[PDB]
Amino acid sequence: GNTYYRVVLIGEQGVGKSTLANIFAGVDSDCEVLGEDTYERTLMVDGESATIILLDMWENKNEWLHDHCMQVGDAYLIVYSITDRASFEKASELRIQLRRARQTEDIPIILVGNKSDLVRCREVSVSEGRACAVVFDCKFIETSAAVQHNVKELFEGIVRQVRLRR
Numbered sequence: 001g002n003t004y005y006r007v008v009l010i011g012e013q014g015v016g017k018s019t020l021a022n023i024f025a026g027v028d029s030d031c032e033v034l035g036e037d038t039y040e041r042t043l044m045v046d047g048e049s050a051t052i053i054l055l056d057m058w059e060n061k062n063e064w065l066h067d068h069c070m071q072v073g074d075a076y077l078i079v080y081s082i083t084d085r086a087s088f089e090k091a092s093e094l095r096i097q098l099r100r101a102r103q104t105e106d107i108p109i110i111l112v113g114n115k116s117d118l119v120r121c122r123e124v125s126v127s128e129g130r131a132c133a134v135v136f137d138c139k140f141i142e143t144s145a146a147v148q149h150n151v152k153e154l155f156e157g158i159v160r161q162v163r164l165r166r
């Protein structure tokens with residue numbers, strides 16, 4: 001409870017949420033019995049221990065699970081694919097949706113452009129991701145979950161952001 005961070009992955013189908021979540025996990029004694037699509041890992045960030053509870057239960061078709069995700073997170077990773085415009089536009093919709101669900105809280109958010117390895121398929125530019133993050137007042141990163149590029153920096157980044165709002 002200060003050492004602990006509940007982090008929620010949201011985004012359109014096929015953007016890479018589950019692939020991100022799997023890289024994050026892999027290998028004790030947190031109080032929480034993990035359910036559905038929940039992962040726990042304890043991380044060292046800036047010389048301080050961080051227990052992350054990661055939720056990856058956002059699907060596009062349990063309808064209440066959307067409202068659940070939007071309510072329980074301390075922090076959010078709003079994921080789109082650089083090779084998919086509509087997922088990028090969806091990300092803005094989800095950010096607005098999240099802001100309405102949490103009107104009075106300063107929620108740490110990272111906007112994540114996944115699939116950066118798919119160079120010839122890029123449809124969304126780095127500048128667009130950046131400009132969008134500026135409009136949203138959140139952070140931005142591009143990852144490739146397939147090759148584990150910037151995935152470490154991402155989860156360090158989100159812990160770093162939630163600590164700044166204390």
Ligand SMILES: Nc1nc2c(ncn2[C@@H]2O[C@H](COP(=O)(O)OP(=O)(O)O)[C@@H](O)[C@H]2O)c(=O)[nH]1
Pocket residue numbers: 011012013014015016017018019020114115116117118143144145146147
């Ligand atoms: N090339 C590439 N493929 C990816 C990346 N991340 C995920 N994928 C692929 O995209 C497909 C759907 O990914 P998934 O993680 O299930 O998306 P989800 O719906 O958001 O959970 C899978 O076949 C993954 O192999 C990435 O960074 N690069």
Ligand SMILES: [Mg+2]
Pocket residue numbers: 017018019
């Ligand atoms: Mg998934």
